[PDB]
Write a protein that binds this ligand. Structure first.
Ligand SMILES: OC[C@H]1O[C@H](OC[C@H]2O[C@H](OC[C@H]3O[C@H](O[C@]4(CO)O[C@H](CO)[C@@H](O)[C@@H]4O)[C@H](O)[C@@H](O)[C@@H]3O)[C@H](O)[C@@H](O)[C@H]2O)[C@H](O)[C@@H](O)[C@H]1O
Length: 718
């Protein structure tokens, strides 16, 4: 059978994972397709309730990684070995058996949402909640799915796919359409002006970035553009769907947000303009009234949320309530808002405050149903009005929204970049990476804005470059480091985006790089013909289970030594042009030191980093043309994700030749065991340098491709 409950134990491929599984916990592997390689898990209770806790069994001596909600809106990571260390509001749990990896996916079932939590006796408890005292139930069959496998990343993907086939309520990341913003540099107004943003400020930011040679091609007009008012520190509520006076042209107040849109696009060459709104309209919802059936609703506290984030009990939203648009009118609300924006030339929305819905289901069939209804309406309106799929999900890390993510393709992966909070930087990097392990199954992770002028700029920028996600700053106008931005952004505003969600390496999945005082975090991604690896020291700070907020904590050393290997890039074989004959040797380029090293298969290279330092490595499979003639493309060596520039690669061993298609401009690098005879770009021989000690070949790609002609055609004759 393979995953099974026997005697009182949960057994996975002949390893006991849980003991003391109680008799009322039921399993099934049946499906309409049919037998499934894991087990759905439920339980039967005596009483109908709107909340149940049930132990699934006892976990001891098994290393785990968990993603848990430290705030309502947002997850972070926790590792451990005992059930007692499993946080409240655990939404994703991965367990290592010492070789076999087991995923636990607590699910939505009917009107109920589940999560996991640990107890003092080391039990892993399943917590099932409808979010509404009127919505009650006494038995469940599919509230948790458990699946095991030998590759931890494949195990997670396979488990998600099985849940999808049972629920049919979401699609996997790879089945969705990415909006076109993810291929361009952008700018977000949020940290530049906060809610004091004006149309002149938007224009000044677009102009200042473009002037330094790194032109953004998308803009997010963040919180502050909307027409909002306090009731007749008081909460603001939405009072109409159009923009406020700061976005009406001063000249003609009848021309609204279309003015800044046309300025952005026609005068400054932007492609996309997005705006922020809350899933409820504004922070205080929408002012009560009959037009969208808005009525006052006050957040209901759930125990697990409040145990981890006690300030939510006295948040302005909790105490002052939200005007909640009616489910009967929610499509009308989004569709009138979004029709107005789209008719003004707006291409998408950043939709924030998403998880509040789970607290507002009391009148209305509970957390799952209300979430599903608002998302169904949001998705219809987005698909109508922003048909490039222009939606970024924000403050949305609840399983109620994840398991109905049928269309939206970009998700903010962590709590906000905080330019003024020194504790936040190392935390942010760990959180984006670990959360991306689970969130990247549903949507492309967005690792958030950052500042190009800031002590942690390079640390943040480097992580964005390897994230696979949208790349955007929130710089105040005129506060730019263009030397840093040139490592991210080409002269036409395009970026070198990697192909996958950036995630921790296999090595790092079970070792906490914020708390263990011993390990570096390694983040891997893939391009088409190289891998990429980012190494970070993020020790010294993390969410505290006793203070219930992010704090600094003590470290034994400042500096830590770890190591890298080619195969740390988990999917590196996929970059090889001949994976069946490849021996696993890679060329490894350090983009900060500018050093090229050949690393044989399995050979480790030491890396030492102090807290808040990082290093980026481009990792390229070596091709052996003939004895003594070996090559690997590196890419745009003065960019962080250098290998993202290589769009085609063919070896012609019979002519001793390499044929490449390369996007961008700047210095191009490659590994060759021999000095090339000639390097040719677009039919003309060009000069080049060769370091015979390292094998590094280097030449300049002078300008971006002429036309249109999207790539430089390069021939390296060995
Ligand atoms: O609004 C635009 C913003 O929306 C998303 O982020 C929202 C943000 O909300 C919560 O933090 C709000 C706020 O808290 C801190 O600010 C103060 C400082 O004491 O605390 C008050 C609110 O409680 C606030 O008035 C104070 O100024 C913080 O320093 C500040 O940055 C925050 O904005 C929530 O805790 C947080 O996790 C976030 O979700 C979106 O993610 C942003 O990109 C942006 O669009």
């Amino acid at each position: 059978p393979a995953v099974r409950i026997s005697d009182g134990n949960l057994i996975i491929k002949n390893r006991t994972i849980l003991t003391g599984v109680p008799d009322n916990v039921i399993t099934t592997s049946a499906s309409e397709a049919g037998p499934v390689e894991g087990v759905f898990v439920g339980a039967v209770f005596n009483k109908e309730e709107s909340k149940h806790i049930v132990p699934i069994g006892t976990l001891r001596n098994s290393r785990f990684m968990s993603c848990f909600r430290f705030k309502l809106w947002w997850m972070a990571q926790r590792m451990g070995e005992m059930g007692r260390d499993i946080p409240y509001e655990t939404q994703f749990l991965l367990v290592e058996s010492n070789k076999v990896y087991t995923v636990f996916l607590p699910l939505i079932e009917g009107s109920f949402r589940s999560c996991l939590q640990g107890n003092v006796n080391d039990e892993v408890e399943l917590c099932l909640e409808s979010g509404d005292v009127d919505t009650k139930r006494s038995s469940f069959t599919h509230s948790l799915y458990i699946h095991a496998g030998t590759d931890p990343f494949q195990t997670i993907t396979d488990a998600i796919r099985t849940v999808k086939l049972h629920l049919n309520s979401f699609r996997q990341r790879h089945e969705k359409k990415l909006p076109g913003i993810v291929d361009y540099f952008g700018w977000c107004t949020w940290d530049a002006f906060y809610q004091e943003v004006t149309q002149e400020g938007v224009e000044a930011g677009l102009k200042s970035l473009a002037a330094g040679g790194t032109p953004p091609k998308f803009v997010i007009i963040d919180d502050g553009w909307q027409s909002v008012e306090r009731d007749a520190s008081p909460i603001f509520r939405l009072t109409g769907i159009k923009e406020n006076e700061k976005f009406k042209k001063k000249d003609d107040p009848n021309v609204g947000i279309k003015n800044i849109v046309k300025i952005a696009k026609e005068k400054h060459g932007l492609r996309y303009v997005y705006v922020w709104h809350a899933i409820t309209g504004y922070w205080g919802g929408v002012r009560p009234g009959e037009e969208y059936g808005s009525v006052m609703k006050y957040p209901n506290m759930s125990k697990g949320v409040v145990e981890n984030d006690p300030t939510w009990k006295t948040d302005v939203m909790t105490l002052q309530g939200l005007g909640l648009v009616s489910p009967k009118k929610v499509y009308k609300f989004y569709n009138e808002l979004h029709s107005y924006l789209a008719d003004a030339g707006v291409d998408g929305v950043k939709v924030a405050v998403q998880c509040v819905l789970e607290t507002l289901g009391g009148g209305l069939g509970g957390r799952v149903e209300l979430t599903r209804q608002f998302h169904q309406a949001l998705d219809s309106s987005v698909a109508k009005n922003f048909p490039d799929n222009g939606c970024i999900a924000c403050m949305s890390h609840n399983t109620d929204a994840l398991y109905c993510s049928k269309q939206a393709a970009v998700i903010r992966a962590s709590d906000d970049f905080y330019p003024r909070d020194p504790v936040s930087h190392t935390i942010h990097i760990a959180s984006v990476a670990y959360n991306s392990v689970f969130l990247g199954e549903f949507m492309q992770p967005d690792w958030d804005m950052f500042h190009s002028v800031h002590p942690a700029a390079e640390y943040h920028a480097s992580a964005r470059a390897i994230s696979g996600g949208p790349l955007y700053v929130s710089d105040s106008p005129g506060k730019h480091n263009f030397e840093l931005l040139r490592k991210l952004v080409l002269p036409d505003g395009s970026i070198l985006r990697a192909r996958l969600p950036g995630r921790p390496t296999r090595d790092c999945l079970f070792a906490d790089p914020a708390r263990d005082g011993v390990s570096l975090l390694k983040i891997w991604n893939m391009n088409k013909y190289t891998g990429v690896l980012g190494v970070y020291n993020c020790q010294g700070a993390a969410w505290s289970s006793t203070e219930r907020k992010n704090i600094f904590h003590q470290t034994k050393t400042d500096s830590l030594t770890g190591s890298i290997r080619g195969r740390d890039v988990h999917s590196i074989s996929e970059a090889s042009t001949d994976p069946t004959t490849w021996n696993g040797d890679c060329a490894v380029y350090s983009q900060s030191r500018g050093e090229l090293i050949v690393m044989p298969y399995n050979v480790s290279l030491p890396v030492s980093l102090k807290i808040r330092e990082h290093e980026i490595f481009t990792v390229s499979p070596i091709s052996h043309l003939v004895d003594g003639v070996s090559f690997a493309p590196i890419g745009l060596v003065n960019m962080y994700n250098s290998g993202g520039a290589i769009e085609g690669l063919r070896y012609e061993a019979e002519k001793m030749k390499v044929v490449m298609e390369v996007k961008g401009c700047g210095k191009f690098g490659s590994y060759s065991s021999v000095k090339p005879k000639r390097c040719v770009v677009e039919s003309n021989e060009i000069a080049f340098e060769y370091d015979s000690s390292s094998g590094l070949v280097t030449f300049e790609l002078d300008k971006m491709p002429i036309e249109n002609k999207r790539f430089h055609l390069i021939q390296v004759e060995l």
